[PDB]
Amino acid sequence: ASRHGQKGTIGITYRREDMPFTAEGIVPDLIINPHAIPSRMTVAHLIECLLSKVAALSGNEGDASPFTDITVEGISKLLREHGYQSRGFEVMYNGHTGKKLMAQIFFGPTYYQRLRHMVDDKIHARARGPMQVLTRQPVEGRSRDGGLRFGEMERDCMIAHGAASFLKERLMEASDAFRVHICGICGLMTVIAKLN
Amino acid sequence: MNAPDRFELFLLGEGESKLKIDPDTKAPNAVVITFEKEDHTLGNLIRAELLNDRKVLFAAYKVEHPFFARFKLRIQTTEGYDPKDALKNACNSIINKLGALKTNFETEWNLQTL
Amino acid sequence: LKEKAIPKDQRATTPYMTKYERARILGTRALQISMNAPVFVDLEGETDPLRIAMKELAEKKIPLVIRRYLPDGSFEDWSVEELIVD
Amino acid sequence: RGNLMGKRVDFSARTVISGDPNLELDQVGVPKSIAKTLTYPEVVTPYNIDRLTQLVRNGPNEHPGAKYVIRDSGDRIDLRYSKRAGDIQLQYGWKVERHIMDNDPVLFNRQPSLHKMSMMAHRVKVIPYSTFRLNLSVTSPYNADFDGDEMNLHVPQSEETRAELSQLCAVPLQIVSPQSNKPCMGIVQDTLCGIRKLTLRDTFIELDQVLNMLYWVPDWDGVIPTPAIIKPKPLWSGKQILSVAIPNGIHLQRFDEGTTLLSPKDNGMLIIDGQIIFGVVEKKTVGSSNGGLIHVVTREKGPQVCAKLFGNIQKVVNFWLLHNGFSTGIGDTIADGPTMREITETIAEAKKKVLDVTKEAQANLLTAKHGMTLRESFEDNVVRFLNEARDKAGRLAEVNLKDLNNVKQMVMAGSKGSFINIAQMSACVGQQSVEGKRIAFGFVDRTLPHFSKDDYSPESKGFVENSYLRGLTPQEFFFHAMGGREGLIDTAVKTAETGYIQRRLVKALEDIMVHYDNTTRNSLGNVIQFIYGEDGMDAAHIEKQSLDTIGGSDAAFEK
Amino acid sequence: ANWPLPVNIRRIIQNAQQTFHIDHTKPSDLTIKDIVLGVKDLQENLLVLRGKNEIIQNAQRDAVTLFCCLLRSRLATRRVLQEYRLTKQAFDWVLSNIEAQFLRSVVHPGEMVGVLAAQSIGEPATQMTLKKVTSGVPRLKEILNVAKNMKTPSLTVY
Amino acid sequence: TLSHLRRTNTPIAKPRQLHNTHWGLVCPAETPEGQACGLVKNL
Amino acid sequence: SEEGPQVKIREASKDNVDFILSNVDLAMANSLRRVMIAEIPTLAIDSVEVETNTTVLADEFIAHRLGLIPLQSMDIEQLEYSRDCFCEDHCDKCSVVLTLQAFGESESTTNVYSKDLVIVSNLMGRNIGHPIIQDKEGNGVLICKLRKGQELKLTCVAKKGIAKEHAKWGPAAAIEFEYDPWNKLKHTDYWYEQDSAKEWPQSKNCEYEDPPNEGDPFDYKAQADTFYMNVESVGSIPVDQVVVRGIDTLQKKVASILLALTQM
Amino acid sequence: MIVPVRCFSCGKVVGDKWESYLNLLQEDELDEGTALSRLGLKRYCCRRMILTHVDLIEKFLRYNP
Amino acid sequence: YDRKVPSPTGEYVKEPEWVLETDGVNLSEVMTVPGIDPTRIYTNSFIDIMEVLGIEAGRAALYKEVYNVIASDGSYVNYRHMALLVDVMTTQGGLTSVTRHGFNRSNTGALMRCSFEETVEILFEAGASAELDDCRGVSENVILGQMAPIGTGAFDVMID
Amino acid sequence: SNTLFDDIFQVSEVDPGRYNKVCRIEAASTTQDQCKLTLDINVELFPVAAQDSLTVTIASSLTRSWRPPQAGDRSLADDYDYVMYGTAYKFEEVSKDLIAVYYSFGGLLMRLEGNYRNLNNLKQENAYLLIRR
Amino acid sequence: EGLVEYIDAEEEESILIAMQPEDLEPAELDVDPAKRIRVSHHATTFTHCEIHPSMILGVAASIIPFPDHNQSPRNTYQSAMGKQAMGVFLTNYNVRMDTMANILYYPQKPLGTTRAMEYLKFRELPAGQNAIVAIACYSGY
RNA sequence: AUCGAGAGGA
Ligand SMILES: [Mg+2]
Ligand SMILES: [Zn+2]
Ligand SMILES: [Zn+2]
Ligand SMILES: [Zn+2]
């Protein structure tokens, strides 16, 4: 995620040649979807892009302190003095074809943080496995090789479709199936069975 | 963990042929070739050099998935024209251009003094 | 309670295979295919039990009768061939 | 509640999800690791026996393989640690627990189970990388996004259960939604903006691009369409290339605002036999809305064709969008100078109006409307002034924004954003509201210690004159923080309350099933509705049709 | 005039116009008697219940009343020839298509309407997030739980 | 580490809402999101 | 002068070469750039074994850094892929073994450079694996800093690889690609608030191409045949060899396609 | 913790530059950016590797064990 | 209030009408007042509508208020789904709250009750009842694990 | 296998309709004033300047997969400096003995109303437009 | 010396504060349009002046760049995300034995920093990398 | 095995 509340997760990893390239050959390490931005209204993300490019060219630090009077037009004037587009849009070329992209593309330096949610640590699968003694049902958690919970909400969502036999196999044979001997005169499972 | 090994991008495997050719169903003189363990690099150039030739009607390269390393080249040519022949002619023309440019740039470098 | 029944003539149950009976019959037929029970349609390049069941449904050859139940207690029986699929 | 109704179950999976555009809507991107662990029990038949034997030869560590075998007696045979795993000879009736394989049915679920649409079953596609993958168009029924969201997966264990999932819980069937009687899935995000950009009459494809895009369509016949422009170059229209994906025999008409058959604005849509005549594609034509193309294709042809259509549209549009490019930037939020000056003059006019209203309030000359406090009337009038000022400045800015502006194009496609987003970004963010009121006098007669006592004014009450781009002052920042805190507590409480409400509704209406006689009854036998919906019809097959006899005069009726 | 109903007769009419390539110069081959009696026959052809007793027949007729009104509005003898050009073949095809679509539209017995309705009301309520009258989830609470006392009792005098 | 070392907890008519008196004493928006949103603040 | 593509070089240096490509289709240009970045092979460290480490840096970090270190790969043609050789693990002709040992004897911090690196296996007349140093002082690329009382001892086996497998086998750093300096072909549509010319900077390459004139109709027939490019060297291979090896590798891929077609 | 070998996007070698750059800004009172330009780094993506890098190695060295 | 009404020619035309709103409801006296239309008056409180006009009028008003809640957000639900809940409350006597007070105290089977709130009290009172659960309810069969009489298991499949 | 309609028009107005490569052109027929048109055109590939009179023809021919222009041994369908392929969506009648034709060329839109022809431009998918200087 | 004082929340109600010291300078035209519109203070008898507005926000907020231009809930979301963000907690990491620890290979100090960030030790001990970020539609992933 | 704390998602 970025410092402006824009969270994300990798979909694909491309090689350097497959990425679009600027005239200087600069390849973006990171590509994020424009459609996210309008709903969030995190303009400081774009401002960070602009100011980081300007600072990298200047060899001087950029001030992003809040409530400090700084003008986007002024930073754009600086970038213009440095021979780049004032807003920061840069012409880019398709990696796969080498053809110019009709839309000039915004790309610049941006602080980005790794987060404590790795795919490998979260992923889990159960199949058959350990069962808690009291309920004869799967133990809890990936580390205990446990089984996911089929919620009562999930049960309702399945009842809506109507797959009664699927629900029977999920809630009887999958988790805790059991066979019990019962007596009619008792009405209860007081019978003792010498099955052998 | 689940990642495919890197060498799978540029190395063939067991039971894998570099080119597999299958005719297009419901199409005249049309064939799709499954280039394996190859990427955009070869396909775009092959398709462009096919497009330069007049006799071929159709030439297109499709990348099935960015995950894997394969691409499909569909070619449709004139009646009496083997699509394989058109592919070979385009390839040889490519090679001639490459050699000519290599020699020209070598002479240019020999001219260069720095 | 005793000899509960519905005469075949003038039955008002819908002459259509609702999604649920089609699904259950297809699943049971697929179970039969997986159990190596005899198959009464000729198969052409088919191994999956479910597609075999679908083809048998198209050929209208499945010896099963769907039992519709009315809340009063009287039951109606509709054979697969009488039932139709849209 | 927890161990009887709803239970931890076997053969379960869950991972982080990411979106793959080149992945069919019904397919699910099952990683290889889960396929190895999860098993489907299968019974050996002469049809499958070969493959099954081969499976067990491959072993449990490499997929397609088999983890376990079951004899007729039932004593399990473990593939991982057994000396016989190489020389097994399987007789008929024995069971092989094969690995999860492509083109198999599995339930795919998102954790908030607010919908039956959340529990649909997908086809299996085994993929290398670890993330669960899915189509962008199947996110909407789940409400899932790729910010790290996690989803779950269930594997059936019997042929009949697989049939229930395949024929009752298939994704294409759940496209038509019983609530709102409209499709719940549609063309989303990059594909939508790309389709808008492509359908423009200004944009024209060329022969090479046309050939590649044509090949991208899977069921494409191979007939090359005739070019739209023929004299100087063989140009093509994006509408033609897109019509290559529209099924034959499909007709759609859409008239809105001013839609002449000439259609200078190119608004409205005319589609005949899979070819598009005039118009520019946007959310109304291609989206989940009633009368959207998804609805028409699902009703006219069938659901599988509609899912294939999802795929085709995504492939073609994403290819062209890759080749055209798109972005956002600060320049998209910068407004023209004189437009900013007119916005500021609008704000100043609003300030003067508020000042004059306060001056009238001070002189005790204002009249009292019946049933409203003097202060109530004053507050409401000033609030309306500020709201109208913000909206007017936003409209001014939006007029100044050119059609090349990226955020404008995103809103035009309907991909993301609204008018309020633009107005807050470039003109003014608005007047803050807390508990349905202006900013309160938390301190003694002062909203902040920096303001004077007994000061009823727009800035003390927290109207932020600046926009997001222009830069908020510290006091405006704090007031905005108050408002955002109210928003966050609203989410944190409303989630729990609505979950409780949904649970109670579900527990009340479990037994409502339409019986054979078409009445809706509970378990006891009590009737609720003798005919469900009073017309006895499923809510999916219900569409908005105009009754021409109701409107109009008697004379036009007669004519 | 815009209301939700099955079958979407307008789309069937457009399908008929394109499918048969109807030509406007030629006159129709439809019989007036056949047009009106066929609309009546189609009214007789749509069924929701099949019992042979009077109350069930009346229930069926009242249950399909609105759809029959739409049928009569869509298939007017003047409109069938003047508004669009029609042939007997296309007219009978449209009649059969309307019948088949309506028959497909009927609820299948066995569907749990209650669970579906509960979910369909619950889901937009989760989406609700934000005037002297109660609105939103608290208003839904007032409606759902029998409220001896309301926070905003009111009434409108006409 | 720093933000955890500087933490507030409020055990329990409108507590969670950012108050005017919180100006400068308490950070306006550095609060957890969840069941205990707003009750826990940062200095 | 040979019929076909023509090249004219603007400037030359050991690090960078700028040239104007002429009479070419654009597809082969981007394909060649892809081949240059990835496909052409290089020698780099693929195995490291650490006998002793006392540095504050962990071993995996060091192995990554060593894999990144640039090594000479000019005679890589005589060297063969370790996977194509017949050795059990590493042959002298398939792998190059280099050892590094360092002790922080100085009380002042003893830094470690790429220069301080020894070669064990036989060079066999080849120019392979020489640690390239462009530093003005002659010291190598910094790897670690050792406090007094610290030592590090390890052995590396370097094999041939492709930049597709790992970015370490990368022959070039920056590639510069430009065409349509006047945008006459209109392959891109500029974004402007007031005016495109005033807002968008003029490219240098614009000077060499003939300026467009307003009042002339847009040329439909015109297609891009003039291109401007610039190539940079990591130094593992000189620039001219890098680009000509790219050409040759692309030709080899085409030839292998042709061979498979012949085989079928 | 220690100087990057190469820029993750440039790929240009930057390990040999680091020391010089530091010495350059101390002996000549050089601006950081002028030192970067003198060092031969004309691209801002390789310039970030140098400008923002922080030598955490020095603090770890101070630890006696 | 703007209003749509048939003009003498026949077409629907707009009509502005004065209409007033209250702050509290005492319905029984309000309707018996000159100068108002008893057929057109409306109220927020549906319980008073049920008391005054009968149960069906309250049913319709309840649907109207739910519809207003749904349409305030802009969302829309097909009339069948909401009408189902309104009819469920209306069908047995007076209005029944969707809470343990009203809809769990019904005559439905005891296990379907114990799945909701007040589990143990339901179980105890029912144990003193010796009431016989019909086992028709879906919750009852979910607890039993047997295939519930859902549409898939509603019919019994038999051979010819 | 011949032309359906031919005329010479003069452009009354040229309109850039928020498009940079396409303008809507309005044209009046010379000689007989009972007919006139308005067509969406690509000005970038053919400059349509005002005060310029242009020739207009429509041809039925000269399905089958498209093929390149080839060697040109096949004769030009027209030496005219503009040609398009399109299909007509609606045929309308403005008044008795007065017809209006609505055509669309892949999204571009043509409207031509006239009375003289009643045997041409029938309701068939195929149609070609040719425009000379 | 008395040049600065400690203010309790109760005592604040009696005092009047100006955000900027320049507010006390005498008032008197031309102004650049982009700079933020601030209200002419229109008030006198200021008892005190704030040290700097950036102090009202907390430590996590001081990391956020240009939070004045962003939506407040997003600032909250980032304030929650910095805790989950990976970084070098302390230099003694190698010596200490924590039950779980994570550390970046090549930590980099943000190119654009808040002034308060100086006293937060972020530039000296950063927890992110400065990546070249492009906003564009590429392959729809 | 209890109970607590923290975080993830709309
Ligand atoms: Mg999320
Ligand atoms: Zn007993
Ligand atoms: Zn070897
Ligand atoms: Zn770089």
GROMACS .gro file of N, CA, C and O (backbone and C1' of nucleotides) and ligand atoms in nm, chain A residues 7, chain D residues 110 143-150, chain L residues 8-10, ligand 1:
model
   62
    7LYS      N    1  -0.456   0.091  -0.076
    7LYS     CA    2  -0.414  -0.047  -0.054
    7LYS      C    3  -0.418  -0.125  -0.185
    7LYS      O    4  -0.485  -0.086  -0.282
  506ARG      N    5  -1.759  -1.565  -0.070
  506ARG     CA    6  -1.704  -1.452   0.003
  506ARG      C    7  -1.761  -1.451   0.144
  506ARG      O    8  -1.876  -1.490   0.167
  539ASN      N    9  -1.929  -0.857  -0.407
  539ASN     CA   10  -1.881  -0.727  -0.360
  539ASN      C   11  -1.732  -0.731  -0.326
  539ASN      O   12  -1.684  -0.648  -0.248
  540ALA      N   13  -1.659  -0.826  -0.382
  540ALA     CA   14  -1.517  -0.842  -0.353
  540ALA      C   15  -1.433  -0.745  -0.436
  540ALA      O   16  -1.469  -0.707  -0.547
  541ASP      N   17  -1.319  -0.707  -0.379
  541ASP     CA   18  -1.219  -0.628  -0.449
  541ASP      C   19  -1.081  -0.684  -0.417
  541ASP      O   20  -1.064  -0.763  -0.323
  542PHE      N   21  -0.983  -0.645  -0.497
  542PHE     CA   22  -0.846  -0.694  -0.481
  542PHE      C   23  -0.763  -0.591  -0.404
  542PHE      O   24  -0.669  -0.529  -0.455
  543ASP      N   25  -0.802  -0.571  -0.278
  543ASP     CA   26  -0.720  -0.501  -0.180
  543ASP      C   27  -0.663  -0.598  -0.077
  543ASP      O   28  -0.625  -0.557   0.033
  544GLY      N   29  -0.657  -0.726  -0.112
  544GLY     CA   30  -0.619  -0.830  -0.019
  544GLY      C   31  -0.734  -0.914   0.033
  544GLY      O   32  -0.716  -0.985   0.132
  545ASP      N   33  -0.851  -0.908  -0.030
  545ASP     CA   34  -0.966  -0.984   0.016
  545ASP      C   35  -0.941  -1.134   0.005
  545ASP      O   36  -0.868  -1.181  -0.082
  546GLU      N   37  -1.004  -1.209   0.096
  546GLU     CA   38  -0.990  -1.353   0.102
  546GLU      C   39  -1.122  -1.421   0.071
  546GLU      O   40  -1.228  -1.376   0.116
 1927G        P   41  -0.656  -0.358   1.009
 1927G      O5'   42  -0.692  -0.482   0.916
 1927G      C5'   43  -0.595  -0.539   0.829
 1927G      C4'   44  -0.652  -0.661   0.761
 1927G      C3'   45  -0.783  -0.637   0.687
 1927G      O3'   46  -0.760  -0.591   0.555
 1927G      C1'   47  -0.799  -0.832   0.822
 1928G        P   48  -0.757  -0.434   0.524
 1928G      O5'   49  -0.876  -0.415   0.421
 1928G      C5'   50  -1.010  -0.431   0.464
 1928G      C4'   51  -1.077  -0.550   0.399
 1928G      C3'   52  -1.226  -0.534   0.374
 1928G      O3'   53  -1.255  -0.484   0.244
 1928G      C1'   54  -1.185  -0.733   0.498
 1929A        P   55  -1.235  -0.329   0.200
 1929A      O5'   56  -1.369  -0.257   0.245
 1929A      C5'   57  -1.449  -0.187   0.150
 1929A      C4'   58  -1.579  -0.259   0.127
 1929A      C3'   59  -1.702  -0.191   0.185
 1929A      O3'   60  -1.758  -0.094   0.099
 1929A      C1'   61  -1.695  -0.415   0.259
 1930MG      MG   62  -1.131  -0.499   0.074
   0.00000   0.00000   0.00000
